[PDB]
Assembly symmetry: D2
Homo-oligomer: 296 residues x 4
């Protein structure tokens, strides 16, 4: 199977005066490329996919594809939906614009059955010829892709090569790789990046890397080289920022941190996302003081 | 405040060959009107709003408006989104197509903070001049509208008159009406329709009423007339069907039941929703046997 | 079946210099009698049963029996254990001292299966000829007595006549009384006393009644007389204190309130229970000011 | 600090005709010793501590102590209680009978606050001069020892040297060792033995080791030597049995398996524990066939 693994970043989407800051966006992707990141995920959860128009999604994927040309960095485009017809369309659309693969979140809100999830992802995978990474985040979607469903999809569909887990469930991570060791388990939870990698996970799709790409990149490559002592050291040092970045719902803290670091001009979200409380603003600013934040 | 209360039905959306069966939709609405229902909710969760196009939503809302003409039955249109710009747009469109009010689900997947939810709903309420009913369903959205946020919205925005609760949390129902007894609490959980009504709730937005509109209508109207003994008797008799209608994710069981009863022509969903398991199909058929299902 | 129902109080156990203050205990029970309580529950959860010696349990049960003599107030003695051999002994012990019935908590910590729960309570019920009330509080025990297990025990064993539910699950309360309407469902959760009673529950075993026995007894008797408007009114008025009494784990707040009210001499617990934080001490004190606390 | 780490077994307690089978108990401990186990835990959760008398607990600790003399194997005696005075007594008794340390479970059922847990464990630790291992299992106790409380006790009390974690929470395991890397984090959850060990955990207190002590011991010692590929390989191979051993509440499956393997004579529990379902009995028997079970 064709795969996209390694250190990867769920890119924030900066807004300026209500619109996508296209210049900032490209500049941020170049900063990730320059700090050892292996792939970028435009228009994921961290990129506020829910509040972007279809045209803004196209724009962000196109900027990511264009910025990564001539480098080793791959573009794993977010292209999920809780409607199978729309998710299939978004997958073909990401391929048509040159994405190397797609990240496709499990359907939110309508809670499909395991059978329904299987048919959902089989339709997506059969619609394109580029790698597809499943994305399990039950706290956001209201549903869980079972281990059996993931493994069935991995074995039945060529393009489906792994899953990005954001479930706080290391037992499930053991279950997955003990029964299907060929899949690419990807950490979707920065605080437990090292435990997932040390169990055989092959990458991360990180929030923290927006702010500290060199550290997340070093962590991942130490771990993939079985330098677990060095990987664990970085994971431990990052625990405090990894947690504070979820003091409020992601991406509210990471965008606050990027703004505090001078990496984006405006602390703008699209409703229903908004600025954090005055405490969490102060707590994020205080935790950042302990880390070396790369500039441009 | 202008309100929409009483016995209400979250209408299923029947499909035939992948298309909305418009004749069937109108005939099912007529059936609801003739069995004492006070309002119909087109394109809610039970109506598979997630997989309908904007034009199909317009279509279902318009059929609901047209079928209720010349009766007392109101149209409380589903018109929510996890993107505030879209939720405001959907509310304005629901008003333009003749809805009497809107039901607006709490943003799913992106988990806004309480501050974000307040701003979300304040934008929606200010966009139209028809009643707005909040909708709290944390098992599906991944977020909760706190009691404090609900009360603030009720008090600060003229159009917001209550909340549909699907949270399995009678403590919260006490909290709401003990601190703001002027709001309209609406049951969004059929099995506990009577406990919510007996605490001062003023209506239901029901799944079971799709199949048993006369029983759900009688229950609600008994409760509103303070005949609690008769309301509880129907609530108790309906428990088995109320629960089996959630053996699988709503609306999979209710559509299965409508098909088994001959009220819809084909057991069709839009992916990622699909037919129930053979075992759950049999269980639904078994529970139905104890109830008298009105025809057309 | 012989039953013990109505408004009941899970009595706090006052300590003085590390021992049970037997006069205070007696003084507290007559105060409950004088304010309309129908039964008292010595040595329950609220009475710190876990840290009392066997002899101490005997003293509190005997004081309860003697103080209630010649009044209509009954003694429903706490007599549970997570070891069946011991639970049987405590039930016999409780009967020998003149208790009218026993409250028997579901086995904590060792998580018996439903089959094990059945055999546990069948052994207890067969050991005495006085009524047995089951007690389901899964947040504390780690196990749940299923509806089916409760109903089977009710139907198979003479002395088992109902269940005290502290599970925040009004759905289960509907489930219980819809399938076995002859059982005595007892609210073990003060905030939702009225919803449980309004569904056919026949009593409460209350924490709040320690402080406000007149209000809890009036609430219960209003509801049993089908004056739901007046029962709901007291339930609504009591919500703030009903919630603050669990700001920390019961009985830490209620004993704090009893001490603040001058109803007990010193705020003493047995470890691992201890005084609340200074912040919750103040919170409790502030909520109490809105209520009229009967004296002795 | 004095520590007890490595591969450890939460010993089952065999019954024959309702009494502790003392000869079987000694023989099972010798089997653990001969298969590379570094310490045995008499009368823990897996040993049915809840239903043993004070006499039987002393008998089991004494058999463990006597059987381990002249070997390197330590005795980490279960000696916890939800009453601090009793937990202090049991700790004192464990030491007097020659235990090398004690395992002390967080108070069950009575739900102490974090302040209360601190005072509870400080009283225990100050009562003896042997190592004390905390034990967090919130699914069974209804309370959680927070990371902050664990670290405070580790730093404030000499003999408190770590925690056995049964919480399904790899995030917390990262939190613990990142802020206090000197403590001994012990896996109390067999399925995730390897992830905990690979993050710096230093031992296991295992259920599966009752049946497969050689495999658990090899896993642990591979991991302590950073032979992670070999440790993970055993962890993966053991996943199926690790999970099936909790098909029903531990120790029902493990005793069933020990009986099925011919390692104990009689499948006897003390109520409220009981035999597993017929179906689970078969599922355990099926899964056992894939593993080589050492004899005596
Ligand atoms: Mg790589
Ligand atoms: Mg599995
Ligand atoms: Mg409140
Ligand atoms: Mg020794
Ligand atoms: Mg070695």
């Amino acid at each position: 199977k064709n795969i996209i693994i390694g250190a990867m970043t769920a890119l924030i989407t900066p807004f300026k005066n209500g619109k996508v800051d296209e210049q900032s966006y490209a500049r941020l992707i170049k900063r990730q490329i320059e700090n050892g990141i292996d792939a970028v995920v435009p228009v994921g959860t961290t990129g506020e996919s829910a509040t972007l128009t279809h045209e803004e999604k196209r724009t962000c994927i196109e900027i990511a594809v264009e910025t990564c040309k001539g480098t080793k960095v791959k573009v794993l485009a977010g292209a999920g939906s809780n409607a199978t017809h729309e998710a299939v369309g978004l997958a073909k659309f990401a391929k048509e614009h040159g994405a190397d693969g797609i990240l496709s979140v499990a359907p939110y809100y309508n809670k499909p059955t395991q059978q329904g999830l299987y048919e959902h992802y089989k339709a997506i995978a059969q619609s394109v010829d580029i790698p597809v990474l499943l994305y399990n985040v039950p706290g956001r979607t209201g549903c869980e892709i079972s281990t059996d469903t993931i493994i069935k999809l991995f074995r039945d569909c060529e393009n489906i090569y792994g899953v990005k887990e954001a479930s706080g469930n290391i037992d499930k991570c053991v279950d997955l790789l003990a029964h299907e060791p060929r899949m690419m388990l990807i950490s979707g939870e920065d605080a437990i990046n090292y435990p997932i990698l040390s169990n055989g996970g092959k990458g991360v799709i990180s929030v923290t890397s927006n702010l500290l790409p060199d550290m997340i990149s070093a962590l991942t490559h130490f771990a993939l080289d079985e330098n677990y002592k060095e990987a664990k050291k970085i994971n431990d040092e990052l625990y405090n920022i990894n947690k504070i970045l979820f003091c409020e719902s992601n991406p509210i803290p990471i965008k606050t941190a990027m703004y505090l670091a001078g990496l984006i001009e405006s602390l703008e979200f699209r409703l229903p996302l908004c600025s954090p409380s005055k405490e969490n603003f102060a707590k994020i600013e205080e935790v950042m003081k302990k880390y070396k934040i790369k500039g441009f």
